[PDB]
C-alpha cells in the first residue's frame, strides 16, 4: 500500500463497515450430525466485522463453552484479539496462546478471521495455521477447534466454518512455504461444518492489557517471539489513532508560526 494514498482510500472505506453487518450470509450445507454445531453471538460478529478491513485480514480467537447436558453445541462466548499484523492474504499472530483466568472458564474453540476475497474453500494459510498451532499447543483439540472465514462480499458478509481431517492437520504441519498454491495442498485437508448465529446470548471482547491488536502498520514491534498480556477491553477500530502513532507524531513546523496574523479576538468564556 502507498502508505499515504492507500492509507486514506481504505480509511474512508472503513467509515461505514457497519453497513455490512445487517447483511451476513450463513454457511448452510450437509451436516455431519455427529460433530458439533458452533453458535456465535450476532453483536460480537458485528464488532469483529466492523473492526476489520476489506483487504487486510484479521483473526480472532474463539473462547466459549459447551452447555451442560447439551454437548454437541459449542457456545462462542468470547473472542480474543492478540497483537498482530496481517497481510491482505492472511493473518500473522504470535505463537503465545491467550491465557487468562477469564479464559480459564472456557475451552479454545479455534480461530476465525476476516477475508477480503470470496473463496469457497479453506485458505491454504488457514489450514496450515490451524495445523501449526496444533503442532506446538495440544490445548486445541481436533474434534473441538474450527477455522472460520468471513468474507466481505459486495456490501455484505459471507462466512463459513471448517474443520480439518487427519491428513489435513498432517499436511498442514508438513508445509512451510507461504504461497496460496502449496504442493500437496488439496481439498482433502478440511471439512466444513455447522456454524450458527446467536442473538441468544452475549459474547465479550478481549484486548491486550498493554497494547493493540493491529500491528498491521508497525512492521517493527511485531515478532513471533514478542510477548503480550490481555484484558476484557474493546478492540478499537482498525485505524484508530493508537495503532497509527507515527503520522499523529508527524508535525513539522517552527513554533513561532503564530507570528503571522496576530489579531486576537476571543471575548468568550
Amino acid at each position: 500500500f502507498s502508505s499515504k494514498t492507500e492509507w486514506r482510500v481504505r480509511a474512508i472505506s472503513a467509515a461505514n463497515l457497519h453497513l455490512r453487518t445487517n447483511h451476513i450470509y450463513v454457511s448452510s450445507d450437509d451436516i455431519k450430525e455427529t460433530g458439533y454445531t458452533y453458535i456465535l453471538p450476532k453483536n460480537v460478529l458485528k464488532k469483529f466485522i466492523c473492526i476489520s478491513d476489506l483487504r487486510a485480514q484479521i483473526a480472532g480467537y474463539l473462547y466459549g463453552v459447551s452447555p451442560p447436558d447439551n454437548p454437541q453445541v459449542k457456545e462462542i462466548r468470547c473472542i480474543v484479539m492478540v497483537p498482530q499484523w496481517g497481510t491482505h492474504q492472511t493473518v500473522h499472530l504470535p505463537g503465545q496462546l491467550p491465557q487468562h483466568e477469564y479464559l480459564k472458564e472456557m475451552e479454545p474453540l479455534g480461530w476465525i478471521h476476516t477475508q477480503p476475497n470470496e473463496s469457497p474453500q479453506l485458505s491454504p494459510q488457514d489450514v496450515t495455521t490451524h495445523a501449526k498451532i496444533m503442532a506446538d499447543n495440544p490445548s486445541w483439540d481436533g474434534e473441538k477447534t474450527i477455522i472460520i472465514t468471513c468474507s466481505f462480499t459486495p456490501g455484505s458478509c459471507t462466512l463459513t466454518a471448517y474443520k480439518l481431517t487427519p491428513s489435513g492437520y498432517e499436511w498442514g504441519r508438513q508445509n512451510t512455504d507461504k504461497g496460496n498454491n502449496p504442493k500437496g495442498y488439496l481439498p482433502s485437508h478440511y471439512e466444513r461444518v455447522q456454524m450458527l448465529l446467536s442473538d441468544r446470548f452475549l459474547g465479550f471482547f478481549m484486548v491486550p492489557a498493554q497494547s493493540s491488536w493491529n500491528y498491521n502498520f508497525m512492521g517493527v514491534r511485531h515478532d513471533p517471539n514478542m510477548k503480550y498480556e490481555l484484558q476484557l477491553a474493546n478492540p478499537k477500530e482498525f485505524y484508530h489513532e493508537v495503532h497509527r502513532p507515527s503520522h499523529f507524531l508527524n508535525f513539522a513546523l517552527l513554533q513561532e508560526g503564530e507570528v503571522y496574523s496576530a489579531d486576537r479576538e476571543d471575548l468568550y468564556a
Binding site: 474512508i12 472503513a14 468470547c78 499523529f248 513546523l253 513554533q255 468564556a269
Partner: protein, 1513 residues
C-alpha cells in the same frame, strides 16, 4: 389576531454599523471639499473651545467625596467633563449616559458612578468589604478589557477592591470568580455566562453595571448588548430591586432613545456633549478614492501615503494603522525606499546627523524581527505579531518620541494607549471571514485609532487622515460628525434571543416575549423611526403600541424555533416548550440553524472520518469559502493530516475540515487570508465541539462522546493524540520531550521510574528531577468499587476515588473536573454518565460516588467505568467492573390484587363503642382496610399489611387493637414504630381515641427505664420507638409485664433497610421469641409500605400467605399525578437558585387553586424559596393567590410571631415550617393551613415527618443535602421520598393527588424506577452486630456460639441472605453455604468481641460476659465506643481529658457538621476555656467538646447549635 408570517432578512440591515442609518450628512464649519486625480479631499478644521462657564470651574480632587479619593493619587485637577459629571455621579443613582467623543475618558467619571456603591459598603474599623457590591464593566474589546482591568485593579488597590475579568470558564472559574469583586467583562462572555445560568449566583449582589462605549449597539454585535439590556431591565422590574446603570457612548444623536432603552432619564441621568470640547482639537482629512481599477489604486494609495509622509517629514509624528500583520511592515520600508529613491528627500528628519538623538535608535539595534533594520531609518514598526516584549520596547522609544513614523495595527492602538501628532487610517477595510470577503472595519475601530491624533500634553491641536473609498467616504465623514444615528441589529438574531429566554425561563409564552421586547431598544427605536424598520405609519396607527406587529415579529421566532426543534411550541397555547436542542443552543451560544444541522447529522456510530465533514459543515463558517489562491495549498493541507479528507474536495467543506485539522496539528499557513480564516473558524470550532459534546453526552452515543471530548481537548492542547502525555505540560523542554517521544514506550508506564530511572532510558540523567516532577504532577486518580444487586433489573455501584497524583495550583487549578460514564460492555449503550469536580481543597480525599446501573435478560459478563479529565488530553482511567460472580436476585412474586368488595362502613363491627370512633369521621373504609379487616379484627393470627404511603394499614392495625380490646379488657399492646414524630402523632390521636372515648388509657415510652416500665403495664397500648423498645426488654425475661403483652405491632417496619431498622428487627425477633417461648400466643402485626419480597418478611414474623397483604403502588384511595424535573447544573447553589420559577409555575399549572406543601433543602432555604415564591407571584400578576381570608384575619394569629419576615410571609399566605419556628408558631401556621387560610407552605426536609397537614400537591426541591464531615452533598433518603411523596393526601376532597420532585437527572430515573414498583429491604445487624449479641450475652440469652447461630436463625437476615445472598456478601446460595456464612460471621464477631475484652469465650465454645459487656449493655452504648473508653480510662484522670474521652463516643457520632460552620466553631472554641490538640473543624467530637464547655460556661449560642447541644446532653 392569530400569528402572521414574516420574512426577517430584507428587514435587517446589511453592512451592520456600515449602514449610516441616516442617509444625509452635513459638513463641519471649516469643511473644504476639493477635486484631484483619482482622489477627492475632504478637510475639516477644528471647532472652537466652548467658553468657560460663568464660574464653572474644575472641581478639585479634594473637593469631591474624600471616600472616593482613593486610587486617583497624583491626580490633582479634574477634566471638564469630570467636573461636569461628578455631581450626577456621586449624588445620583440616576441611570447615567455619558455622550462624549473619544478623548473625554469617561472611565474616570464612571469611577465615581461606581464609587457611590463602593463607599456604600464600608465601615469604621473595617473597609469596603466586598460582601455587598460588585459592579460589571461591559467593554467591547479584549484590549480594553485587559488595559482597564489592569489599570483599575492597581488604581483602586489602595482600597483593595478586587478588580478581575470575567474570562475564566464556567466551573473552572466560579469559585475564584466568586471572590472576584467589581469586574470587567466582554458583553459576549457575559452573554454566554447568563445563558449558562451561572450569572444568577453572582446576581442579587450585582449592584451596578457600566456599559462602556455602548456605540457598539450600532454593530451587529449590538444584539448581545440589547439582549442583556432587556434582560436586566425586565428582570429588575420583577425583582423590584434596582440595578445601578452607567452608560457610555461617543458624541452622537438619538441620545433620548438611548436613555430610554437604558432606563436613563434625559432629565438628569443624561450627559450629552458636543465634539468641540476636544482637549486636543480634531482636524480631519479624508481621501475618497474614485479609482475603478484596484490595480492603479494599489499604487496611488501608497503614493498618497508618501505624500502625507512628506507632509510630516520634519518635526512631527505619525502613527499609521494598517490592516494586516505583514502589510504593516511592508508599508514600512516603503517609506524607507521612498526617501531613498527621492534622493534623501524627507529623510534626515532629526536635528542633524546625531542631534535629535539618532544615537537612541542607533545604540538600539538588536531586535528579534527585521525592525532592527528599520530602526537605522526614521521609520519603525510595532505589533504583537512582531513581538510582545518588543511591543513595550518600541513604545518605550515612542514615549521617548524618537520614532517619527510608527507603523502598527488597529489592535495595538486600541490596546495600551499612545497618542500621535498625526493618525493615518490606511484603507479602513478588513477581510471578514464571517463575510469571507473584503468590507469596512466598523465605527468604533476607526474611532479608537483616529482618536489618537493629538496627544494630551505633547501638542495643542491634532489632525488625522483616513484613506477611504469614494462612495463610502461620505459615511466616513458622517461617522465622526455626530450625524451618525445608531440602530439595533438584533433584528436577525431575534429568534435566538427568544430561544435563549425560553431556555432561561424568562419567557413562557409570546406574552412574556412581548414584555421582554418592551425592555428592548427596538421598541423605542422602531417607534421613533417606524418608517425605517418597515413600520408603515398607517399600520402603526392601526396598532398604536404595536402589540400586533411585535407579535408578528414573535411569529417568526416561534416558527423558526419549532422548525429547528429548539422549542416545541403550539399555535393556540401561545407558550413554548424547549428541548435538549434549545438547551444546548442556549448553553453553548449555538445558532438555531447549526442546532438542527447537528440534530440531522449526528448519529451513534460517528467516526472522525465523518466528524471532519460534520465539523466543516457547521453553518457557523457558512460564508467562508475557498479562494482560487488557496486551491494550491489545499491539496497540501490534505497531504498532511493523520485523518483522511477524501470526504470532501476543494470547497468550503474541504477548506474548513482541513483548517480544523491544521489548527490541531499546529500547522503553518502561507496566506494571510488563510491564516485569518483559520484563526476564526478554529475559534468557532471549540464551541462547536463542546455543543456536539453536549448533544452526544445527552443522547448517549458512546464512541461519539469519547471522540468528542478528546477532540475538544485536542484543539485545546493544539496537539493531537500523537504528542506524548508530557504535552499537557508545557513546562517540558521540546528536545528531551521529543527524545522520550520517539521511543515506543507507554506514558502509562512512566511512574515506576525514580528520580533518575526515567532518564536512564532517554540518556537524560541530569534532567530526571523535573522529569519525575512532571511525571507525578500529571493528574492521576485511582479508583475502587463496591457492588450489590438491588433488583434483577438494576444493581448499584459505590465508588472510591483516591489520589494517585500530587496537585499544584498553576498546573491543576482549583479542582479536578472529570466526566465519568457507566457504560455497556462493548462501550455502546450509555447506561449513565456523571460529571464530578474534586477541589484542590477537596483533594486526596475519596468522595463517595454512588450510582445504580441496569442489566437485562442476556446478561453481560461485566460493565465498564470510564473516567476522563475534562480538558486534560491523554488523561484516562478505566475500570472493568465484573459481573462474573453475580447472584441474580429473587424475582419477588406478584402482589395481591385489590378485590373490589362491598364498601365496608363503620357499621361492620358490632361494638358501638368501637363504631363511634369512626362514625363521625368517614362514610366507608377503603377496600384495603376492608379486605384486611376480616383478618385483623375478625382473626387473631399474625397479620401483615404492605401498602404504599397513604393506604392506611394503621387502620387495619387499629382493627387488631379493637379485636384485642374485645378479647381482653386490660390486654397489653406494643406499638413499635421507628418514626419518632409519626409515632408521637399516633400516640396523640390514641390518647383521645381510647382514653377518652373508650376510657382505656394510652402509654408513651420515655427515656428513664423505671418510669417507662411504670408506663407499660399501666397503659393498655404502649407506643415506642425501635431502640426505645430494645433498651427495655433487652432483658425481658426479667420483666413480668413484658411477657404479658397480648398484641404486638411493628408499624412502618419497611424502614428496616434504612437506618434505625436493625434495632427494631432485633426487638421484633425478640417479640417472636416471646410468642414462641412464653407458652402463650402473642398476636403479631406487621405494617409496611409497598413491598416486593413481602412473603419472606411475613414468614420471618410468622404470618400466613393468606394474611400477608402485599399490594402495589396502584392500590390506594388517591391516584397520583407524579412529576419529576431534571436540573442540569449539578452545582448546589446555582441549581437551588435557578430552579426557583419551576415550583411556582408547577403550582400555576397543576395546583394554582389548592394546597401546595413544598419540601426544601435547608432550614434557611425554606425561607429563600418562599421569598422567591412570593416574588414570582408578584411578577405573575396574580398576587396574594395564597391568601384565603381577609387582612385583619391575619393579625389575630400574626400577633404571636418572633420572625420579622414571617409576618409579611403570612400576609402573602405562604408560611414556613422548620426547627427554628417556635412550637406555638408552627402550630399556628399548621392551624391556618389545616383550616385552609394558608395555601402553600415552605416545609423543611426535617419537618417531612412530624406534620399533620397533608396536601393536594407536594413539591420536593433540591433533593441533595450538604454534610460537612465528608464536605459534600448527598441524595435524599428513599424513605424520605416515600413519606414526603405520600404527604399529598387529600382523599377528603381531592379526587387525586399531585406529587412533584425536582432533582438532578441522576435522581430523576432514581425516583422514576424505585417509586412505581415497590422497594426492597435488607437487614444490617450483619453490620452492627456487637449490640444485639452483646445484650444477649449479658442476658445469657445467647451464651454460646450455638446460641448465637440459633438467635440468628430467627431473623430476617436468615431469610433474605439465603434468598439473594451476594448483596449480603454471600457467594453461595445453598444451605451449607448459608450455614458457612452464618457461623463464619459468628466466629468473627464473637472473636472481635472477646478481643475487645467484652466477654470471655471459654475453650472457643462457651461464652461468659465480663464487666465490660455488663456495663456496656447496661448503659446501652456500642461495644467499640466502650473499647475506646477502656483505652482512654487511666488512673490520672481529669475532667479535661475525660471530656474528650467520653465525647469521642460513636453515641455522639449522630451530631453532624452542617453548612459552612468551620469559622464560627473556631470562634466558639476560642471563647470556651478548654483548647484542643489540633482542633478539627469537621470533627463532631471537637464540636461536642466545645459544646460541653459551653454547657459548663452557660454561654448561649444559637438555637440551631443548641439543638445539638441539648441532644448530646
Amino acid at each position: 389576531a392569530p400569528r402572521q408570517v414574516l420574512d426577517l432578512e430584507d428587514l435587517v440591515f446589511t453592512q451592520g454599523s456600515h449602514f449610516m442609518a441616516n442617509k444625509r450628512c452635513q459638513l463641519p464649519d471649516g469643511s473644504f471639499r476639493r477635486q484631484r486625480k483619482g482622489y477627492e479631499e475632504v478637510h475639516v478644521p477644528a471647532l472652537k473651545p466652548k467658553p468657560f462657564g460663568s464660574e464653572e470651574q474644575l472641581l478639585p480632587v479634594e473637593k469631591l467625596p474624600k471616600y472616593a479619593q482613593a486610587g486617583f493619587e497624583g491626580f490633582k485637577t479634574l477634566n471638564r467633563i469630570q467636573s461636569k459629571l461628578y455631581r450626577a455621579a456621586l449624588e445620583t443613582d440616576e441611570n447615567l449616559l455619558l455622550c462624549a467623543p473619544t478623548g473625554a475618558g469617561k472611565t474616570n467619571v464612571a469611577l465615581m458612578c461606581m464609587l457611590r456603591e463602593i463607599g456604600k459598603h464600608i465601615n469604621m474599623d473595617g473597609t469596603i468589604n466586598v460582601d455587598d457590591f460588585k459592579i460589571i464593566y461591559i467593554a467591547p474589546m479584549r484590549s480594553l478589557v485587559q488595559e482597564m482591568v489592569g489599570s483599575f485593579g492597581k488604581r483602586l488597590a489602595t482600597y483593595g477592591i478586587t478588580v478581575a475579568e470575567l474570562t475564566g470558564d464556567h466551573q473552572l472559574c466560579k469559585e475564584e470568580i466568586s471572590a472576584t469583586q467589581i469586574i470587567v467583562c466582554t458583553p459576549e462572555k457575559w452573554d454566554i455566562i447568563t445563558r449558562k445560568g451561572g450569572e444568577r449566583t453572582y446576581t442579587q449582589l450585582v449592584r451596578l453595571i457600566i456599559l462602556d462605549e455602548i456605540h457598539l449597539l450600532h454593530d451587529d454585535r449590538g444584539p448581545v448588548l440589547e439582549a442583556l439590556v432587556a434582560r436586566a431591565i425586565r428582570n429588575i422590574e420583577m425583582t423590584q430591586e434596582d440595578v445601578r446603570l452607567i452608560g457610555l457612548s461617543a458624541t452622537l444623536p438619538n441620545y433620548e432613545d438611548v436613555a430610554t432603552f437604558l432606563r436613563v432619564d434625559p432629565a438628569k441621568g443624561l450627559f450629552y456633549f458636543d465634539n468641540s470640547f476636544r482637549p486636543v482639537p480634531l482636524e480631519q482629512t479624508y481621501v475618497g478614492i474614485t479609482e475603478k481599477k484596484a490595480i492603479k489604486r494599489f499604487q496611488i494609495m501608497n503614493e498618497i501615503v508618501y505624500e502625507k509622509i512628506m507632509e510630516h517629514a520634519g518635526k512631527n509624528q505619525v502613527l499609521v494603522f494598517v490592516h494586516s500583520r505583514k502589510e504593516t511592515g511592508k508599508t514600512a520600508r516603503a517609506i524607507r525606499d521612498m526617501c531613498l529613491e527621492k534622493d534623501t528627500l524627507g529623510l534626515f528628519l532629526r536635528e542633524g546627523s546625531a542631534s535629535t538623538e539618532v544615537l537612541r535608535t542607533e545604540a538600539e539595534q538588536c531586535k528579534n524581527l527585521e525592525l532592527k533594520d528599520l530602526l537605522p531609518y526614521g521609520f519603525a514598526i510595532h505589533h504583537a505579531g512582531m513581538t510582545r516584549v518588543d511591543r513595550t520596547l518600541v513604545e518605550d522609544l515612542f514615549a521617548d518620541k524618537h520614532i517619527q513614523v510608527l507603523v502598527s495595527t488597529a489592535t495595538l492602538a486600541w490596546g495600551v494607549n499612545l497618542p500621535a501628532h498625526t493618525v493615518i487610517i490606511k484603507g479602513t477595510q478588513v477581510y471578514s471571514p464571517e463575510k469571507g470577503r473584503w468590507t469596512e472595519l466598523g465605527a468604533l475601530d476607526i474611532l479608537q485609532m483616529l482618536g489618537r491624533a493629538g496627544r494630551p500634553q505633547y501638542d495643542t491641536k491634532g489632525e488625522g487622515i483616513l484613506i477611504t473609498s469614494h462612495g463610502e467616504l461620505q459615511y466616513y465623514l458622517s461617522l465622526l460628525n455626530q450625524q451618525l444615528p445608531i440602530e439595533s441589529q438584533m433584528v436577525s438574531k431575534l429568534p435566538d434571543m427568544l430561544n435563549a429566554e425560553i431556555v432561561l425561563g424568562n419567557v413562557q409564552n409570546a406574552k412574556d416575549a412581548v414584555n421582554w421586547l418592551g425592555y428592548a431598544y427596538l421598541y423605542i427605536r422602531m417607534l421613533r423611526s417606524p418608517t425605517l424598520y418597515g413600520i408603515s405609519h398607517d399600520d402603526l396607527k392601526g396598532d398604536p403600541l404595536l402589540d400586533q406587529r411585535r407579535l408578528d415579529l414573535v411569529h417568526t421566532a416561534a416558527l423558526m424555533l419549532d422548525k429547528n426543534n429548539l422549542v416545541k411550541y403550539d399555535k393556540k397555547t401561545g407558550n413554548f416548550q424547549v428541548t435538549e436542542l434549545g438547551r444546548i443552543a442556549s448553553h453553548y451560544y449555538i445558532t438555531n440553524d447549526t442546532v438542527q444541522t447537528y440534530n440531522q447529522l449526528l448519529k451513534p456510530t460517528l467516526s472522525e472520518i465523518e466528524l471532519f465533514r460534520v465539523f466543516s459543515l457547521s453553518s457557523e463558517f457558512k460564508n467562508i469559502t475557498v479562494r482560487e489562491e488557496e486551491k494550491l495549498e489545499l491539496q497540501k493541507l490534505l497531504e498532511r493530516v493523520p485523518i483522511p479528507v477524501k470526504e470532501s474536495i476543494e470547497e468550503p467543506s474541504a477548506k474548513i475540515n482541513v483548517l480544523l485539522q491544521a489548527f490541531i496539528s499546529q500547522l503553518k499557513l502561507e496566506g494571510f487570508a488563510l491564516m485569518a480564516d483559520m484563526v476564526y473558524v478554529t475559534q468557532s470550532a471549540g464551541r462547536l465541539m463542546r455543543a456536539i459534546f453536549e448533544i452526544v453526552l445527552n443522547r448517549g452515543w458512546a464512541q461519539l462522546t469519547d471522540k468528542t471530548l478528546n477532540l475538544c481537548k485536542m484543539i485545546d492542547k493544539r496537539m493531537w493524540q500523537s504528542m506524548c502525555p508530557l504535552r499537557q505540560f508545557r513546562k517540558l523542554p521540546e528536545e528531551v520531550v521529543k527524545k522520550i517521544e520517539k521511543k515506543n514506550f507507554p506514558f502509562e508506564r512512566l511512574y515506576d521510574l525514580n528520580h533518575n530511572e526515567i532518564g536512564e532510558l532517554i540518556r537524560m540523567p541530569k534532567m530526571g528531577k523535573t522529569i519525575h516532577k512532571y511525571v507525578h504532577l500529571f493528574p492521576k486518580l485511582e479508583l475502587s468499587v463496591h457492588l450489590q444487586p438491588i433488583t434483577r433489573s438494576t444493581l448499584k455501584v459505590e465508588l472510591t476515588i483516591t489520589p494517585d497524583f500530587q496537585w499544584d495550583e498553576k498546573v491543576h487549578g482549583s479542582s479536578e473536573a472529570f466526566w465519568i460514564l457507566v457504560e455497556d460492555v462493548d462501550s455502546e449503550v450509555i447506561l449513565h454518565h456523571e460529571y464530578f469536580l474534586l477541589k484542590a481543597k477537596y483533594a486526596q480525599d475519596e468522595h463517595l460516588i454512588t450510582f445504580f446501573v441496569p442489566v437485562f435478560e442476556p446478561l453481560p459478563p461485566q460493565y465498564f467505568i470510564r473516567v476522563v479529565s475534562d480538558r486534560w488530553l491523554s488523561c484516562e482511567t478505566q475500570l472493568p467492573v465484573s459481573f462474573r460472580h453475580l447472584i441474580l436476585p429473587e424475582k419477588y412474586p406478584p402482589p395481591t390484587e385489590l378485590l373490589d368488595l362491598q364498601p365496608l362502613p363503620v357499621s361492620a363491627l358490632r361494638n358501638s363503642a368501637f363504631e363511634s370512633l369512626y362514625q363521625d369521621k368517614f362514610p366507608f373504609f377503603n377496600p384495603i382496610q376492608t379486605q384486611v379487616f376480616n383478618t385483623v379484627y375478625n382473626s387473631d393470627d399474625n397479620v401483615f399489611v404492605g401498602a404504599p404511603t397513604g393506604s392506611g394499614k394503621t387502620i387495619c392495625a387499629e382493627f387488631a387493637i379493637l379485636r384485642m380490646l374485645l378479647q381482653s379488657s386490660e390486654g397489653r399492646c406494643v406499638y413499635i414504630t421507628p418514626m419518632e414524630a409519626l409515632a408521637e402523632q399516633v400516640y396523640m390521636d390514641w390518647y383521645e381515641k381510647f382514653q377518652d372515648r373508650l376510657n382505656k388509657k394510652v402509654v408513651l415510652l420515655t427515656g428513664e427505664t423505671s418510669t417507662d416500665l411504670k408506663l407499660l403495664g399501666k397503659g393498655n397500648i404502649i407506643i415506642s420507638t425501635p431502640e426505645k423498645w430494645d433498651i427495655l426488654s433487652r432483658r425481658w425475661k426479667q420483666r413480668k409485664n413484658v411477657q404479658n403483652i397480648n398484641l404486638f405491632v411493628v408499624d412502618e417496619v419497611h424502614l428496616i433497610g434504612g437506618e434505625n431498622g436493625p434495632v427494631l428487627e432485633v426487638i421484633c425477633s425478640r417479640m417472636r421469641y416471646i410468642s414462641s417461648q412464653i407458652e402463650r400466643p402473642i398476636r403479631i402485626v406487621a405494617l409496611s409500605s409497598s413491598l416486593s419480597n413481602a412473603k419472606d418478611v411475613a414468614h420471618w414474623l410468622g404470618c400466613s400467605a393468606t394474611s400477608t397483604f402485599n399490594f402495589h403502588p396502584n392500590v390506594r384511595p388517591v391516584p397520583l399525578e407524579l412529576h419529576i424535573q431534571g436540573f442540569n447544573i449539578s452545582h448546589t447553589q446555582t441549581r437551588l437558585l435557578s430552579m426557583a420559577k419551576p415550583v411556582y409555575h408547577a403550582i400555576t399549572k397543576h395546583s394554582p387553586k389548592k394546597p401546595v406543601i413544598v419540601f426544601v433543602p435547608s432550614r434557611k432555604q425554606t425561607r429563600l424559596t418562599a421569598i422567591d415564591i412570593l416574588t414570582t407571584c408578584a411578577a405573575d400578576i396574580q398576587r396574594q393567590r395564597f391568601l384565603h381570608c381577609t387582612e385583619k384575619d391575619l393579625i389575630p394569629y400574626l400577633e404571636k410571631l418572633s420572625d420579622s419576615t414571617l409576618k409579611e410571609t403570612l400576609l402573602n399566605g405562604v408560611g414556613y415550617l422548620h426547627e427554628g419556628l417556635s412550637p406555638m408558631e408552627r402550630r399556628l401556621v399548621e392551624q391556618l393551613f389545616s383550616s385552609g387560610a394558608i395555601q402553600v407552605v415552605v416545609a423543611s426536609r426535617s419537618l417531612c415527618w412530624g406534620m399533620n397537614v397533608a396536601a393536594h400537591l407536594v413539591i420536593i426541591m433540591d433533593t441533595q443535602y450538604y454534610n460537612g464531615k465528608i464536605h459534600a452533598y448527598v441524595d435524599y433518603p428513599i424513605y424520605d421520598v416515600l413519606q414526603m411523596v405520600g404527604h399529598a393526601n387529600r382523599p377528603l376532597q381531592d379526587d387525586e393527588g399531585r406529587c412533584v420532585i425536582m432533582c438532578q437527572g441522576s435522581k430523576k430515573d432514581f425516583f422514576k424506577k424505585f417509586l412505581y414498583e415497590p422497594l426492597p429491604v435488607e437487614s444490617h445487624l450483619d453490620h452492627c452486630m456487637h449490640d444485639h449479641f452483646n445484650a444477649e450475652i449479658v442476658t445469657k440469652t445467647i451464651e454460646n456460639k450455638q446460641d448465637a447461630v440459633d438467635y440468628l436463625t430467627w431473623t430476617f437476615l436468615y431469610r433474605r441472605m439465603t434468598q439473594n445472598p451476594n448483596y449480603y456478601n454471600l457467594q453461595g446460595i445453598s444451605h451449607r453455604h448459608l450455614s458457612d456464612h452464618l457461623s463464619e460471621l459468628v466466629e468473627q464477631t464473637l472473636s472481635d468481641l472477646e478481643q475487645s475484652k467484652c466477654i470471655s469465650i471459654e475453650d472457643e465454645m462457651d461464652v461468659a460476659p465480663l464487666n465490660l459487656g455488663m456495663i456496656a449493655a447496661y448503659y446501652y452504648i456500642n461495644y467499640t465506643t466502650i473499647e475506646l473508653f477502656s483505652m482512654s480510662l487511666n488512673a490520672k484522670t481529669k475532667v479535661r481529658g475525660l471530656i474528650e474521652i467520653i465525647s469521642n463516643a460513636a453515641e455522639y457520632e449522630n451530631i453532624p457538621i452542617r453548612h459552612h460552620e468551620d469559622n464560627l466553631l473556631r470562634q466558639l472554641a476560642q471563647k470556651v476555656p478548654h483548647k484542643l490538640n489540633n482542633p478539627k473543624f469537621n470533627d463532631p467530637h471537637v464540636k461536642t467538646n466545645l459544646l460541653l464547655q459551653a454547657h459548663l460556661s452557660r454561654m448561649q449560642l444559637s438555637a440551631e447549635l443548641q439543638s445539638d447541644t441539648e441532644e448530646i446532653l
